[PDB]
Amino acid sequence: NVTDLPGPTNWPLLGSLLEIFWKGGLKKQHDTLAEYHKKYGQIFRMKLGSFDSVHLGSPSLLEALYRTESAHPQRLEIKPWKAYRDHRNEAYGLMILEGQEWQRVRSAFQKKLMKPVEIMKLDKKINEVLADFLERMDELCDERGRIPDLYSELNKWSFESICLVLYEKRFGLLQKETEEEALTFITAIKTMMSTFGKMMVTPVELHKRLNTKVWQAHTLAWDTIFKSVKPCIDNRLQRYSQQPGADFLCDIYQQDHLSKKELYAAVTELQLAAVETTANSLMWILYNLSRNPQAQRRLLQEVQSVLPDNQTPRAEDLRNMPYLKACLKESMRLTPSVPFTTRTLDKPTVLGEYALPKGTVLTLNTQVLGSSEDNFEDSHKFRPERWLQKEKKINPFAHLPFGIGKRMCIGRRLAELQLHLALCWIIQKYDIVATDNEPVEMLHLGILVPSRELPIAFRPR
Ligand code: HEM
Ligand SMILES: OC[C@@H]1O[C@@H](OCCCCCC2CCCCC2)[C@@H](O)[C@@H](O)[C@H]1O[C@@H]1O[C@H](CO)[C@@H](O)[C@H](O)[C@@H]1O
Ligand SMILES: OC[C@@H]1O[C@@H](OCCCCCC2CCCCC2)[C@@H](O)[C@@H](O)[C@H]1O[C@@H]1O[C@H](CO)[C@@H](O)[C@H](O)[C@@H]1O
């Protein structure tokens, strides 16, 4: 068939853009899609307005796509960012780069942020950050052990951290009398990150022509952002000019031939695609911990066994902490920072008892895979163990917080590194206890963030 989908009644003009609201709206989209999947099975499809797409929610369909993968996979078109690059005449980046052009840049970095021997080498820099972060932590801690604006806090950490990795400089976000251009560049990011959203459901080209107030905002946001990044990536190059092998950036710029104009673009989308996501999972892991004392116990122990005394962690030991590394796992399978990624076919393909029309929009509901009762017994349970007892099962195509395919998360490594170190110093110097036992809903706003302030307390030892 072709119209056997099935899916939710196709109600006039809107499509399912009805229930989607008469159920919570966009911020609860992941939930309702989760139900349809429960309903209409492994695969179906819906149309929000004139937007049509088919949802994939199974380990089968996932391999049944991984294998049929193309050389240049591609997700939805982020036209607004593209619009800006063309307008202002700037390069593109792995988020929007395409086909050959993409594959080129990917390879160059891809081969350096996903190679342990290299990533692990970030070792100290991260700790330097982790250091000042905790040093500031107890200061923010009141006496109940709580932090006001935790997310905001963890975001500062992840920002400051990744920029030490990218521009090789501290921005001073972790302590007063050190902000200013720190936050203008931050706002620029925050403004830009909300505005572009509006030129997606609306004709960016139309906007541009009318020079709409919104077009101008987004423009300026990015105009600024590129002005904050450029010099940072010019100092890093002028500094490791005659020192081959040293700077991973300067090495790409020279023996992978890429223009400063391309590096600027690539780095920036790296930062953008980094920070919040990172911070976001860090917070959900903490949260899950605060709700499972036993598992936090078995975790503390493993952090004392491998680190007797309050000594500083180091990339490596992680090899000796299978419960922690898998705590971060299960955490992501129960509370994913990212619910789903999207793909575009560029050749008709086979899925379900169906075959897709080529050029179709696919929404890989990588979330739902977490409750696949056939791969996860008691899906609604935080069990860092299932990922350890080597008697288990779990086909890699059931847990994919970083996306499947070769156009999957390029950060994954360095992300997990950071989410492994910080989490050591945390569970080290602090106990993580629940401030309360009342409901906390996940809300899609780019990445599942929580409905309210996280009810978790940081009591010292
Ligand atoms: C807990 C942290 C993170 C999660 C869960 C995560 C999530 C993902 C996911 C699910 C994708 C989509 C994959 C697909 O197309 O199927 C993605 C793409 C990507 N991520 Fe992350 N990410 C995180 C951190 C990082 C970090 C720290 C960086 C930056 C160095 C990074 C940068 C990117 C980039 C540049 C892409 C686009 C790659 C391309 O298609 O060319 N990520 N990420
Ligand atoms: O930019 C990330 C997300 O990507 C955006 O684009 C993809 C979704 C397309 C529908 C979005 C629009 C629907 C109605 C008009 C406004 C948003 C949306 O998810 C958007 O809500 C957006 O959420 C945005 O991220 C912010 C958090 O830093 C939100 O506070 C902000 O409102 C912004 O919308
Ligand atoms: O969260 C917003 C979107 O929600 C879904 O619908 C998006 C369009 C929203 C439909 C329009 C609604 C808002 C205004 C018009 C009426 C209702 C999916 O596309 C989903 O993949 C999602 O698409 C978004 O894509 C962005 C790409 O950067 C990311 O924020 C993220 O992938 C997100 O899912």
Side-chain angles (χ1 to χ4, degrees):
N1 303 291
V2 188
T3 305
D4 182 50
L5 11 160
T9 288
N10 208 298
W11 303 287
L13 298 298
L14 301 312
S16 268
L17 209 66
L18 205 50
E19 312 173 86
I20 295 305
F21 282 111
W22 225 281
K23 286 182 168 297
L26 287 197
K27 58 173 171 289
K28 259 187 174 64
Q29 172 170 37
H30 58 256
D31 280 294
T32 51
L33 290 171
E35 294 185 57
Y36 292 146
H37 275 289
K38 213 177 190 66
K39 183 73 169 188
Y40 316 123
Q42 179 193 59
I43 181 172
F44 70 106
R45 57 99 78 161
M46 82 192 304
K47 198 189 304 181
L48 313 199
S50 63
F51 173 99
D52 182 61
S53 178
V54 47
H55 293 46
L56 274 17
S58 290
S60 179
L61 293 178
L62 263 292
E63 181 138 7
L65 213 68
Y66 174 62
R67 307 304 195 184
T68 88
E69 174 175 301
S70 83
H72 308 160
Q74 62 165 48
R75 301 169 293 245
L76 258 65
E77 196 181 340
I78 288 184
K79 315 197 73 293
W81 290 4
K82 272 160 65 195
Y84 176 91
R85 302 306 162 65
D86 303 327
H87 181 316
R88 211 58 71 165
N89 184 44
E90 265 293 318
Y92 281 34
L94 302 195
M95 285 305 297
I96 53 189
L97 236 14
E98 292 304 299
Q100 293 291 60
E101 284 203 291
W102 168 82
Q103 170 188 303
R104 173 194 175 189
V105 191
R106 177 67 169 222
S107 292
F109 284 103
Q110 138 91 67
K111 159 234 58 169
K112 191 154 298 199
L113 299 180
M114 288 293 276
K115 313 307 154 189
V117 298
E118 281 305 66
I119 294 309
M120 297 192 280
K121 193 155 83 73
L122 261 319
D123 216 312
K124 198 183 188 300
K125 294 204 162 192
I126 299 176
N127 285 316
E128 291 202 356
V129 146
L130 259 165
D132 297 318
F133 182 50
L134 277 66
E135 167 177 357
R136 197 226 198 191
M137 279 199 65
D138 54 48
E139 213 301 330
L140 313 184
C141 289
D142 52 9
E143 64 295 302
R144 306 285 299 304
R146 306 162 158 183
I147 307 296
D149 268 353
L150 189 46
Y151 200 84
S152 170
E153 293 319 69
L154 264 21
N155 252 272
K156 289 211 187 58
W157 163 57
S158 183
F159 186 79
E160 181 82 310
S161 178
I162 193 55
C163 312
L164 198 254
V165 190
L166 272 39
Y167 316 108
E168 285 207 358
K169 69 162 295 178
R170 299 287 302 306
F171 289 62
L173 285 199
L174 295 175
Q175 208 71 301
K176 78 220 309 158
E177 216 290 291
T178 318
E179 257 68 46
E180 316 322 72
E181 189 154 5
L183 46 305
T184 96
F185 170 50
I186 295 303
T187 62
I189 317 285
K190 303 211 290 183
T191 285
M192 176 290 272
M193 273 305 279
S194 50
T195 164
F196 90 90
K198 287 203 291 293
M199 320 209 268
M200 284 257 298
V201 292
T202 76
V204 73
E205 311 76 9
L206 180 48
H207 268 99
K208 179 174 186 174
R209 222 211 316 292
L210 312 184
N211 190 22
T212 53
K213 220 286 178 286
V214 170
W215 170 260
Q216 298 164 73
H218 187 277
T219 312
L220 204 63
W222 283 103
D223 274 79
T224 276
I225 303 183
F226 272 81
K227 295 196 67 299
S228 301
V229 172
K230 284 183 175 55
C232 285
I233 307 182
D234 287 21
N235 284 53
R236 183 146 170 184
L237 264 45
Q238 171 180 47
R239 190 169 53 217
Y240 297 32
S241 312
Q242 287 191 296
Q243 295 180 53
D247 218 306
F248 85 80
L249 204 67
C250 169
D251 273 47
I252 296 210
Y253 166 72
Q254 291 180 305
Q255 54 185 306
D256 224 303
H257 300 78
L258 240 59
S259 71
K260 298 183 185 180
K261 181 157 298 311
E262 296 183 59
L263 288 168
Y264 295 168
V267 182
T268 297
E269 320 212 2
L270 218 40
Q271 183 177 308
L272 298 174
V275 180
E276 191 166 320
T277 337
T278 292
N280 193 274
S281 48
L282 190 255
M283 190 181 77
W284 287 102
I285 174 47
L286 300 176
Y287 171 77
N288 288 297
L289 255 5
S290 99
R291 288 290 209 279
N292 306 281
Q294 306 180 181
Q296 200 182 318
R297 267 271 57 204
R298 177 171 183 175
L299 206 291
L300 215 198
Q301 305 172 175
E302 182 174 296
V303 183
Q304 304 169 301
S305 78
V306 182
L307 291 68
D309 156 57
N310 265 48
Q311 48 168 46
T312 299
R314 305 218 68 172
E316 209 319 300
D317 317 24
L318 305 188
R319 174 185 57 70
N320 292 307
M321 288 175 273
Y323 194 76
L324 164 156
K325 299 182 75 164
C327 236
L328 206 180
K329 300 186 67 180
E330 180 75 1
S331 192
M332 295 224 185
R333 185 224 58 139
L334 198 68
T335 67
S337 243
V338 178
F340 43 53
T341 186
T342 204
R343 275 304 177 305
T344 259
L345 313 165
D346 66 342
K347 64 185 189 56
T349 179
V350 289
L351 275 315
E353 297 280 52
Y354 308 58
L356 286 65
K358 146 64 199 297
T360 313
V361 188
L362 296 169
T363 68
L364 316 184
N365 195 323
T366 125
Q367 176 192 68
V368 59
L369 300 182
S371 61
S372 181
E373 209 55 55
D374 177 60
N375 239 310
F376 303 113
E377 194 65 303
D378 307 311
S379 45
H380 64 299
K381 298 289 188 175
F382 188 58
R383 282 228 297 154
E385 310 79 59
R386 52 169 54 106
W387 313 92
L388 291 188
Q389 36 113 301
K390 212 81 82 305
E391 298 107 296
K392 54 77 166 294
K393 312 173 69 174
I394 304 174
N395 66 304
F397 294 117
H399 181 68
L400 306 103
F402 290 89
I404 188 44
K406 91 170 67 59
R407 210 203 166 74
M408 62 152 238
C409 193
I410 192 192
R412 201 176 95 59
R413 283 280 173 291
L414 168 50
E416 255 169 347
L417 180 56
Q418 308 206 70
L419 288 176
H420 279 155
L421 284 217
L423 213 180
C424 257
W425 303 60
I426 283 182
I427 193 160
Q428 187 115 297
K429 173 171 172 174
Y430 295 91
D431 198 54
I432 287 61
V433 48
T435 72
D436 66 87
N437 298 178
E438 301 307 311
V440 162
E441 291 251 70
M442 286 187 102
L443 304 193
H444 197 161
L445 312 185
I447 44 204
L448 299 176
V449 282
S451 54
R452 56 210 199 48
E453 196 80 14
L454 223 59
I456 75 169
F458 296 158
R459 260 111 188 179
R461 298 282 190 49

